[PDB]
Structures are given as C-alpha cells and as structure tokens.
C-alpha cells in the first residue's frame, strides 16, 4: 500500500484532518490549492510550515486537509498545525530519527502552536452579568 | 498555596513508621506501594499522600527528622 500517515490540529472549535502519502508535492486545503486560502491577509500563516523548513522537504509528498468548525481565523491556525504535524508524523514512520528531531527543532524554535495545541478554552457565563466576569451595573438611589 | 493538610501529613507519617524499608526515593514506586499498603478513596488524595512521603525520605537521608 502507498506509504501514508494521519495527523490533526486544533484551536477553539477548529479541527483540520491532514492526510499524507508519498507523492509529487501536491498540497491542497478543502479541495482547493493552498494558495487560495482566505481570509487573504492571514495567508502567510498557512505558508509558514513550508517556508520554515524548506520547500524541498515537500517535493515527494501529497497533503490533503479538510477543516470544519470554528471561525475564519481559528481555522487557519488549525490548517498550519495539521501540516506541521503531518510532516513530522511522516518522518516518524518512513524516515530516520535524526531528521524528525531536526524538523521539530525548526518549528519549536519559531512558534510552539505549529505542533502543540493552545490550552486556552472559554469560561462559562455566570448569572448576574453579561459575561464570564462582567456584572450588571449597580444602583443605590 | 501548596500547604498540605493534616489528613496528608499524618497519613504519610504513619506510612514511614511502618514501611520504611519498602519505600524508596521515587514517586512512581511510592505511588504503587500506597495502593498495596493503605486504602485511599481517590486518585487525587493518593498522589498527594505518596508525594509527601517521597519528600520525607529525602529529609531522612540527610539526617533524622523530629516527629
């Protein structure tokens, strides 16, 4: 069977399932090329994993991602983390250890979110206010 | 704060006076002994009890401790 691997990443309610297999450098998000990701301004976030390591490492692989949930911003953080994790899980199974360590070093030294999810989660609202810690205005006269 | 309560200080104290030879300077091993040596009602309390015991073995290594 064709060599392959699976990984994922999260931020808030966003989840991106990245499927990797030996190939010719295809990289696609939601069936469209990575280049067409939106919103436009945050596109270099999706590119970030490819540049920080070198486009050479991606020439012999195909990556297809599918993202659901969350919002227009948290998704882009899911996508970049699925690409970073997928590449390091592929080197985990089909390439030597020394390469895996070096690749993790490039990502960690730059932005921990490319590998490890963000721990922040929201807090419940409490009665007596409009939000988690805010409260309604009080009056004495 | 990281101040333990008396239900932890005393439980660890009882273990050392009855099981010094078997305890070690290692949390993980002491975690498993407390399951075979004392009946505790939670995973949380069991971790805390064993953790203090490790801390006390370190003290006894450098010299005897009052109490």
């Amino acid at each position: 069977a064709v060599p392959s691997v699976q990984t994922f990443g999260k931020k808030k309610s966003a989840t991106a399932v990245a499927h990797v297999k030996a190939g010719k450098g295809l990289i696609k998000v939601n069936g469209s090329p990575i280049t067409l990701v939106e919103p436009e301004i945050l596109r270099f976030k999706v590119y970030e994993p490819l540049l920080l390591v070198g486009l050479d490492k991606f020439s012999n692989i195909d990556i297809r991602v599918r993202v659901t949930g969350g919002g227009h911003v948290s998704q882009v953080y899911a996508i970049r983390q699925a690409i970073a994790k997928g590449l390091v899980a592929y080197h985990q199974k089909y390439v030597d250890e020394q390469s895996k360590n070096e690749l993790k070093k490039a990502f960690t030294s730059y932005d921990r979110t490319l590998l490890i999810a963000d721990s922040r989660r929201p807090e419940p609202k409490k009665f007596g206010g409009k939000g988690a810690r805010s409260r309604f205005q009080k009056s004495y006269r | 704060g990281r101040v333990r309560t008396k239900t932890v200080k005393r439980a660890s104290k009882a273990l050392i006076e009855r099981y010094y030879p078997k305890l070690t300077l290692d949390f993980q091993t002491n975690k498993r002994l407390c399951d075979e040596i004392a009946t505790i009602q939670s995973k949380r309390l069991r971790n805390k009890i064993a953790g203090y015991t490790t801390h006390l073995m370190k003290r006894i290594q450098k010299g005897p401790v009052r109490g």
Binding site: G31, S32, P33, L36 | -
Partner: protein
Amino acid sequence: PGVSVRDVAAQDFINAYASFLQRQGKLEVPGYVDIVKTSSGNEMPPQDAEGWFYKRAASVARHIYMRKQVGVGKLNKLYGGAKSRGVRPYKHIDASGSINRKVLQALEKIGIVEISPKGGRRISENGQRDLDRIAAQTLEEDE
C-alpha cells in the same frame, strides 16, 4: 494538468462568468430587475442596475458545482443579511424568494442546471463543461 472550478478564486471566477453570460445574451432576464431589491434587509436596490442579475447567476452556477443539491431555501439563507430595524438591534432576515427562484428556473433553460431526486437542483453534465471551459480561460489570463 487540467482545471476545475475550485482552482480559481471565487471573485475572479464570478466576474469572468458574469461578463460571459452578458455577452452571449442567451440568459433570460425577468424584466423587473430594475425595480426590486435583492433582500428585505436591504434599503436600496442594487447599484449595478445593468449587470447585477448576470452576476447573481454567476454565483449560483458555481454554488451548485461545489455542493450536491440546493434549493430556494438554501439560497435565501445564503444571500440573507442583517436587518437594521433602527432603534432595535439587528437580526438575520432571509433574502428574496422570487429572485432566487427565477434564477433557478432560468438556468435550466440555458442548460446549466437540472432538477435532481431528493429535491433541489443539481449541476448537469452540460453545466460542468460550461464552467470548466471558462475556468481555463481565467487562469490563462494571469498576465
């Protein structure tokens, strides 16, 4: 290599296709285009009184492509907007059923869409040929 509609930005594709339909002139225009406003939430009629209809047809043609089936309801939701309501706050208000219906009727006649079981419209064989030919044209014009 080949090309699919998903290989070209949505804004680029929609502009290119709206021009094409306008030029060929084989799409039906319901006639009251110059009067109505595309959703109750709006407070003025569309600005481009010339080519706003051919623009709507360009979007819906692509929207069927991406998905399996759609309907008048899905399109009322898709193109709905936020009502003002003045002093009182906003709320989502669905779009205009008449427009989104007569665009779907019009598309079948020119042959881009066909009805499908389970209800709702569906991209036809012909529609795929129409939308993909143009796609290669937009990419070729990257100069």
